[PDB]
């Protein structure tokens, strides 16, 4: 009745959310990133902006947030505010008019092994090159370039959870059918930072328009 409070107090007594959660600073933080697409909210063709409801699952091990379950009556998992812990600064590179990073700091699930699972919701309003040629029978290929903004690949390595986005919770859109989806990890060198390649995962969705509305009202 006081053991979970004791655990939280012991973990964070001198925890630092500034330093990376590794035993040794030369180690790399291995972050698993899984984009879950909940709903294709909008595809703004004229503004070339795609609005999507997503869950950006992030998983990593915090070396300092381990505990022994026997010390706390077998407590093997706890929920803690994400603002207290170190987090990967995943930024949507191709943001058009939304937020770059996560702003809804939900609680993370922390396990006795130090494994943190964070699944914050986000509404990504990403830029997409709307190809007009075959409209209204066009297929659109819209993508989300997600990566750690300040941590480079030698410092925090992000890895895709799966080759494809998690569409299991996808609310079927009445205008667009996702014919294909895939996630590709890339390392690229920016002119800002020529000696350190930065990792990103570009999730992409091949969306085909359902033409029936435009067939009826235009064609």
């Amino acid at each position, epitope marked *: 009745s006081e053991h979970e409070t004791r655990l939280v107090a012991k973990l964070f007594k001198d925890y630092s959310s500034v330093v990376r959660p590794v035993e040794d600073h030369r180690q790399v933080v291995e972050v698993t990133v899984g984009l879950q697409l909940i709903q294709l909210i909008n595809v703004d063709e004229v503004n070339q902006i795609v609005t999507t409801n997503v869950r950006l699952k992030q998983q990593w091990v915090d070396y*300092n947030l381990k505990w022994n379950p026997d010390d706390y009556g077998g407590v093997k998992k706890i929920h803690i505010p994400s603002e207290k812990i170190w987090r990967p600064d995943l930024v949507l590179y191709n943001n058009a008019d939304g937020d770059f990073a996560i702003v809804k700091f939900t609680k993370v699930l922390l396990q006795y092994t130090g494994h943190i699972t964070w699944t914050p919701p986000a509404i990504f309003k990403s830029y997409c090159e709307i190809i007009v040629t075959h409209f209204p029978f066009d297929e659109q290929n819209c993508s989300m370039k997600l990566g750690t903004w300040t941590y480079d690949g030698s410092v925090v390595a992000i890895n895709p959870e799966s080759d494809q986005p998690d569409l299991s919770n996808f609310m079927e859109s009445g205008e667009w059918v996702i014919k294909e989806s895939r996630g590709w990890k890339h390392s690229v060198t920016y002119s800002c930072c020529p000696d350190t390649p930065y990792l990103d995962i570009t999730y992409h969705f091949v969306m085909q328009r359902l033409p029936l509305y435009f067939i009826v009202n235009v064609i």
Partner: antibody
Amino acid sequence: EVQLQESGPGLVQPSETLSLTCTVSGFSLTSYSVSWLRQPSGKGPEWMGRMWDDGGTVYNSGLKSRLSISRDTSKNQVFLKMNSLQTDDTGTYYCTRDERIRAINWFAYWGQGTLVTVSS
Amino acid sequence: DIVITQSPSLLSASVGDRVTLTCKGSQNIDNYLAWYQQKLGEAPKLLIYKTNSLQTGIPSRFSGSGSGTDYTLTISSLHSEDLATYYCYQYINGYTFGTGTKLELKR
């Protein structure tokens, strides 16, 4: 500097209640946890429970019903009390000061240990 | 919890010999292994924690090594002071102790 001394009855009747006092010197119970260990005869040691620095307690799940732990921070004493004693409880009982790193704890110092024999 | 085994159960070595006691778990102990020295009728004394952190005041002849599920305690030169029983124990998931290795001077 740091020393711990277990004390208690060397012989206890079965189904009686064992009581042990871990006397403490060289440190304050308010800043160091005290764990209790026992080594049954012919077996490796096992962890019984801990008195936390904050005054809480935790017990081995096999002994949680049989154990209570308490302390007196003015006397620098930690008390173990165990009931429903059985022949298999015969062994050497240690109290240990626990070091910590964040939430992880380990036994850094041992007392000399008190041999407890349970026989009618 | 992580089951722990030690070998040898009994080891004989002469003063000055290098000895390497071994400790092996059933699961990844993640370097959260400690070693302590117990003598008959004496309070056990912690030698090493986190598999290689030497306890303050322990002679430098003691050193620890290992990773994953296999760990070792090395005495670089056995003194007569060091004839004792050595237990490894694990504190990352529950608390489990080895059976202990008893160390005797060779005769």
